Design an enzyme around this catalytic site. Structure first.
Site, PDB file in Angstrom:
ATOM      1  N   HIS A 171     -66.384  28.205  11.202  1.00  0.00           N
ATOM      2  CA  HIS A 171     -65.712  28.380   9.915  1.00  0.00           C
ATOM      3  C   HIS A 171     -64.310  27.753   9.956  1.00  0.00           C
ATOM      4  CE1 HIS A 171     -63.872  30.296   6.411  1.00  0.00           C
ATOM      5  NE2 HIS A 171     -65.073  30.688   6.029  1.00  0.00           N
ATOM      6  N   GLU A 183     -63.242  24.334   7.744  1.00  0.00           N
ATOM      7  CA  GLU A 183     -62.155  24.329   6.772  1.00  0.00           C
ATOM      8  C   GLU A 183     -61.052  23.323   7.102  1.00  0.00           C
ATOM      9  OE1 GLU A 183     -62.270  25.703   3.935  1.00  0.00           O
ATOM     10  OE2 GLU A 183     -64.147  26.744   4.368  1.00  0.00           O
ATOM     11  N   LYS A 241     -62.429  19.722   6.451  1.00  0.00           N
ATOM     12  CA  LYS A 241     -62.468  19.392   5.028  1.00  0.00           C
ATOM     13  C   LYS A 241     -61.097  18.936   4.507  1.00  0.00           C
ATOM     14  CE  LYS A 241     -64.117  22.524   2.480  1.00  0.00           C
ATOM     15  NZ  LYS A 241     -64.502  23.888   2.010  1.00  0.00           N
ATOM     16  N   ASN A 242     -60.030  19.610   4.949  1.00  0.00           N
ATOM     17  CA  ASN A 242     -58.669  19.256   4.539  1.00  0.00           C
ATOM     18  C   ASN A 242     -58.240  17.915   5.116  1.00  0.00           C
ATOM     19  OD1 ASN A 242     -58.605  21.747   3.313  1.00  0.00           O
ATOM     20  ND2 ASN A 242     -57.379  22.730   4.917  1.00  0.00           N
TER      21      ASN A 242
HETATM   22  N1  LIG Z   1     -54.531  18.249   6.687  1.00  0.00           N
HETATM   23  C1  LIG Z   1     -53.903  18.361   5.524  1.00  0.00           C
HETATM   24  N2  LIG Z   1     -53.139  17.219   5.002  1.00  0.00           N
HETATM   25  C2  LIG Z   1     -52.454  17.300   3.761  1.00  0.00           C
HETATM   26  N3  LIG Z   1     -52.488  18.483   2.986  1.00  0.00           N
HETATM   27  C3  LIG Z   1     -53.237  19.569   3.521  1.00  0.00           C
HETATM   28  C4  LIG Z   1     -53.976  19.621   4.766  1.00  0.00           C
HETATM   29  N4  LIG Z   1     -54.567  20.814   4.948  1.00  0.00           N
HETATM   30  C5  LIG Z   1     -54.235  21.463   3.910  1.00  0.00           C
HETATM   31  N5  LIG Z   1     -53.426  20.801   2.975  1.00  0.00           N
HETATM   32  C6  LIG Z   1     -52.810  21.176   1.642  1.00  0.00           C
HETATM   33  O1  LIG Z   1     -52.611  22.585   1.575  1.00  0.00           O
HETATM   34  C7  LIG Z   1     -53.602  23.113   0.625  1.00  0.00           C
HETATM   35  C8  LIG Z   1     -54.471  24.216   0.990  1.00  0.00           C
HETATM   36  O2  LIG Z   1     -55.635  24.165   1.699  1.00  0.00           O
HETATM   37  P1  LIG Z   1     -56.728  25.337   1.500  1.00  0.00           P
HETATM   38  O3  LIG Z   1     -55.983  26.648   1.724  1.00  0.00           O
HETATM   39  O4  LIG Z   1     -57.866  25.037   2.328  1.00  0.00           O
HETATM   40  O5  LIG Z   1     -57.224  25.203  -0.006  1.00  0.00           O
HETATM   41  P2  LIG Z   1     -58.034  24.037  -0.756  1.00  0.00           P
HETATM   42  O6  LIG Z   1     -58.828  23.232   0.211  1.00  0.00           O
HETATM   43  O7  LIG Z   1     -59.046  24.957  -1.718  1.00  0.00           O
HETATM   44  O8  LIG Z   1     -57.191  23.145  -1.531  1.00  0.00           O
HETATM   45  C9  LIG Z   1     -54.502  21.951   0.087  1.00  0.00           C
HETATM   46  O9  LIG Z   1     -54.860  22.101  -1.292  1.00  0.00           O
HETATM   47  C10 LIG Z   1     -53.675  20.743   0.441  1.00  0.00           C
HETATM   48  O10 LIG Z   1     -52.918  20.306  -0.658  1.00  0.00           O
HETATM   49 MG   LIG Z   2     -59.942  23.500   2.411  1.00  0.00          MG
END
Ligand SMILES: Nc1ncnc2c1ncn2[C@@H]1O[C@H](COP(=O)(O)OP(=O)(O)O)[C@@H](O)[C@H]1O
Ligand SMILES: [Mg+2]
Ligand SMILES: Nc1ncnc2c1ncn2[C@@H]1O[C@H](COP(=O)(O)OP(=O)(O)O)[C@@H](O)[C@H]1O
Ligand SMILES: [Mg+2]
Lengths: 354, 354
Positions: free
Chosen positions: B226, B230, B233-234
């Site tokens: 998990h 996550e 995906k980011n």
């Molecule tokens: N690796 C990353 N590089 C740039 N921004 C990121 C990264 N990981 C997270 N973020 C930013 O912080 C936010 C939050 O991530 P998350 O809590 O998973 O929610 P979500 O994927 O639903 O947008 C994202 O919407 C993004 O803008």
């Molecule tokens: Mg995410």
């Protein structure tokens, strides 16, 4: 005495890097700076003096802390003496420069004298977790307060008494970040070689997200930037040398410098084996070392002083990453200053803990 | 209002178990039964009290009132077992069926609670710091009761045996790298559907604890998956959208490191980073830079992943270089005896917090 309590009733007035620049770059009115500082410095001295009395008694009574307290009360009295003078009397403008120079010489040894008090106290006495936490809190604030008063005084000294002509006081309006990195790396390499007969090389790269070809410049105090980098390089080199003790060659210390919209960030990477997550926080503790452990916490104060930051994250068994964050815009580089007030005095089970 | 049995059992603290202890009762059904029939109501009653003091316009959404309804029934279902003897075979078996019933009933808790937050928004969740505090504790409490029940079900039921190499949901020899590659594959396939392309994986590994040996720890692979999923995906979203003007995508880089105390997983992208200013906003529930819809938009990925890491005394951190890219980092305890549940307790301290 009376003025300590009186001026401790004012809260300090934070300045932006831009204000410091805008004032002293073109107009530089010695009258205004003088009026500002004869008020502001006592306020900051009196504020931290009040906070000193909150400290454990056997700490306050050390000759070390009593020294600091007396220098401060002495400096505070010297400065307050100029409230009776006019900003137009020049024998006053001139003496104020001199008084600032005397004060800067009087506080030259403040950091190590206070550090000695802490060491004395911690060695001698048993300290509840609460009190050791209050000490950290106090020291971040005491040292931040000294960083800020040194900053202000030097600006006035250097601009009106002189230093580097390219710079406005201690501020470089076009600070070549990469060049400060190389220079700080060298100071460290020197000491590393002059101690281990060997030292890692630098692998530096830079990205200017703003203008993707532009060299990287911001407004900053290069002296401060140098101190942070130097301390982080000392650590990364020592860790690299000691961890690769059984090695022919040292892995490079890798640095990347990035300029974005609102941040300048410098990441310093070593393969020096890291430290366990359990131990990280202790690194930023004032009395933790394995030559005294002031590197990390003071460097972090320099980073925070203008709303930047400094973080470590490590891969135990492999190496460590140190990141410096600095504000990119001079208008947002505003002093982070401790004030002694209800909220601070107050500061001196939620989850299950193992 | 609040039923008597909730009032009563919430007066206890939950008891944190370690991964080692959880492993071990997979090596007496009687003893797991005696423990769980008491512990589970304690953890349900504790969290039901916190729900009770939630914002009344939140607590009164059909979603939250429904989750409350469920947690109350489960507690009663379990308390009905307090009379039975732990060596009553019809009881032990009935208890398994109850855990299966309760797990099915709670299956929709997470989305039902999130939906209630949607409805609740006459407010702003990202900023409401009591809502954040509650959400961390609510979800952690759910993670921990599901974990406890699944352990009992997968070890003692007739029908649900889970993975035969696992003890319950615990893999005593978790192949960390294999879970990395799997999580990355999943993220890759979701990314392709949104962008018709996705970065590649570049993985390195260093076993400091047992050099050259593959990296294993005791862990729950579903939790790790998990977390990795996550974060991937980011990294992929960030990498693709940032590099959409370039002829190809820089890979996502992952290093897995086994140290003496820690397993550390670092996931580095060149996806353009985020300003230091909004980093902490990123871990706020519902915070997203994507429109709410799924690849992104609900803003649960980061705070939930961090919960999983911390649940067993690990941690999850983001360090970014705005204008370049982001390092995401997972820390897990390498020893099963140090992997101890991190649980909310409703008490005076927790109450002061709201
Ligand atoms: N690796 C990353 N590089 C740039 N921004 C990121 C990264 N990981 C997270 N973020 C930013 O912080 C936010 C939050 O991530 P998350 O809590 O998973 O929610 P979500 O994927 O639903 O947008 C994202 O919407 C993004 O803008
Ligand atoms: Mg995410
Ligand atoms: N890059 C690094 N790799 C491994 N350990 C480090 C690193 N940086 C700092 N440390 C650890 O944290 C401690 C503190 O550093 P510092 O606060 O500068 O004090 P000192 O340099 O006098 O030891 C060091 O003693 C060291 O053990
Ligand atoms: Mg050092």
């Amino acid at each position: 005495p009376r003025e300590v309590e009186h001026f401790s009733r004012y809260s300090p007035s934070p300045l932006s890097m831009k204000q410091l620049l805008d004032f002293g770059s073109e107009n530089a009115c010695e009258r205004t700076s003088f009026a500002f500082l004869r008020q502001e410095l006592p306020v900051r001295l009196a504020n931290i003096l009040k906070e000193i009395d909150i400290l454990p008694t056997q700490l306050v009574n050390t000759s070390s802390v009593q020294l600091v307290k007396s220098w401060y009360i002495q400096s505070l009295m010297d400065l307050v003496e100029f409230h009776e003078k006019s900003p137009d009397d020049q024998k006053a403008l001139s003496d104020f420069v001199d008084t600032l120079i005397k004060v800067r010489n009087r506080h030259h040894n403040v950091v190590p004298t206070m550090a000695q008090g802490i060491i004395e106290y911690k060695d001698a006495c048993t300290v509840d977790p609460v009190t050791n936490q209050n000490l950290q809190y106090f020291l971040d604030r005491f040292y931040m307060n000294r960083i800020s008063t040194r900053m202000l005084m030097n600006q006035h000294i250097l601009i009106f008494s002189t230093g580097n002509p390219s710079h406005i006081g201690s501020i470089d309006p076009n600070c070549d970040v990469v060049a400060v990195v190389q220079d700080a790396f060298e100071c460290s390499r020197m000491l590393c070689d002059q101690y281990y007969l060997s030292s890692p090389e630098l692998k530096l790269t830079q990205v200017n997200g703003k203008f993707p070809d532009q060299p990287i410049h911001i407004v900053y105090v290069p002296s401060h930037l140098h101190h942070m980098l130097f301390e982080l390089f000392k650590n990364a080199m020592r860790a690299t040398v000691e961890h690769q003790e059984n090695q022919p060659s040292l892995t490079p210390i890798e640095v990347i410098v990035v300029l974005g919209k609102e941040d300048l960030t410098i990441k310093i990477s070593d393969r020096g084996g890291g430290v366990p997550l359990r131990i990280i926080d202790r690194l930023f503790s004032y009395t933790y070392s394995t030559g005294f452990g002031y590197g990390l916490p003071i460097s972090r104060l320099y980073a925070k002083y203008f709303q930047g930051d400094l973080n470590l994250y490590s891969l135990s068994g492999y190496g460590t990453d140190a990141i410096i964050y600095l504000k990119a815009l001079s208008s947002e580089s505003i002093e982070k200053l401790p004030v002694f007030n209800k909220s601070a005095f107050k500061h001196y089970d939620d989850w299950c803990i193992p």
